[PDB]
Amino acid sequence: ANELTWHDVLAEEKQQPHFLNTLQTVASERQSGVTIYPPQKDVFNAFRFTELGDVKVVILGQDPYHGPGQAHGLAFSVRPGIAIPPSLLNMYKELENTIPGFTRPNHGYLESWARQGVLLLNTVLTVRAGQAHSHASLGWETFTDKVISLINQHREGVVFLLWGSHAQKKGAIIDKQRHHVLKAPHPSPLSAHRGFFGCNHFVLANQWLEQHGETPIDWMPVLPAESE
Ligand SMILES: O=c1cc[nH]c(=O)[nH]1
């Protein structure tokens, strides 16, 4: 497939009602004082780090971290000066019981992940504060719905790490004769203990990449950049 940038593919979408009437729901409450995660400039951050073309894997969570300084737009990632929260911890656990000689990192910044076709995504792009979901009745599920579709429509043989019931629907529109699709109960300490922990998404994905010529994913995160 030709080189189609999200700019290309999102367009119309951007320029659409349902969506617009979701930014509005958004802009608004942030405006009523109410603290919302993540700041607006971070909202689509994902699409920023990993472009549709370079899309190799898709991790689909659904509503960001409702903590202060947590959420930065990368489905499950945090910036460097932040402490790995339950969810990532658990990820890591899996990145322990399954990968070779993997030792969690001492950070929760998954930029590297992203830079390697990993579509660290969520269904609900924004959220109240310390209040789960609390924002799942707007055009959020509708946006992401298309996002997948677009992905689907395009780029062949993609593994969809679909974590949680919610994430599991809004991704179960994918033609499997053409894409790979896995199911794991949310990593979150509220659900992890139901199968997440046991799933093999990581390897099981690095396999799919293997057998189609695709370079596996370095699940070992890194905090680069240094100079005088
Ligand atoms: O990106 C994130 C952060 C918290 N919980 C999720 O499901 N995704």
Distance CA 179, CA 95 (A): 23
Task: List pocket residues of ligand 1, CB cut-off 6 Å.
Answer: 61-62, 64-65, 75-76, 87, 122
27: tokens are 């802009």
Q: Which residue out of 122, 124, 140 has the highest number of ligand 1 atoms within 8 Å of its CB and is therefore the one to mutate? A: 122
Q: Could you give the number of structural domains in the chain? A: 1
Distance CA 8, CA 10 (A): 6
Q: Does the N-terminal peptide bond of residue 38 adopt cis geometry, omega within 30 degrees of 0?
A: yes
Three-state SS annotation for 126-195: CECCCCCCCCCCCCHHHHHHHHHHHHHHCCCCCEEEEECHHHHHCCCCCCCCCCEEEEECCCCCCCHHHC
- Which helix or strand (DSSP H or E) is residue 24 part of? helix 17-31
Most distant CA pair in the chain: distance in Å?
A: 51
Q: Could you please report the per-residue DSSP string of 98-129?
A: SSTT----S----HHHHHTTEEEEESS--B-S
CA 26 to chain centre: 20
Coil vs helix vs strand at 211: coil
Positive/negative CA dihedral, 65, 67, 69, 70: negative
| N-term to C-term CA, the chain | 42
- Give counts: helices (H), strands (E), the chain: 8, 4
Contact between 121 and 46 under an 8 Å Cβ cutoff? The reply is: yes
From the list 201, 174, 173, 206, the residue with the least C-alpha distance to 187 is 201
Q: Say what the alpha-carbon torsion angle 201, 204, 206, 212 is, to the nearest 10 degrees.
A: -130
Length, in residues, of the chain? 228
Method of elucidation: X-ray
Note down the domain range covering 57.
1-228
Q: Whose CA is nearest to atom 7 of ligand 1?
A: 61
Strand partners, 57: 118, 159
Distance CA 116, CA 192 (A): 25
- Rounded (5°) CA angle 154-43-4: 20
Q: What is the CA radius of gyration of the chain?
A: 17
Contact between 209 and 215 under an 8 Å Cβ cutoff? The reply is: yes
* CATH number of the CATH domain containing 77: 3.40.470.10
Deposited resolution, Å: 2.3
Active site residue 63: yes
Distance CA 190, CA 184 (A): 13
Neighbour-count burial for 124-157, b at 16+ CB within 10 Å, e otherwise: bbbbbeeeeeebeebbbbbbbbbbbebbbeebee
Distance CA 156, CA 115 (A): 19
Phi, psi of 181 (to 5 degrees): -145, 115
Coil vs helix vs strand at 5: coil
| 139 CA from centroid of ligand 1 (Å) | 18
Q: Which residue out of 37, 44, 45, 62 has the highest number of ligand 1 atoms within 8 Å of its CB and is therefore the one to mutate? A: 62
**Catalytic member of 42, 63, 145, 175:** 63
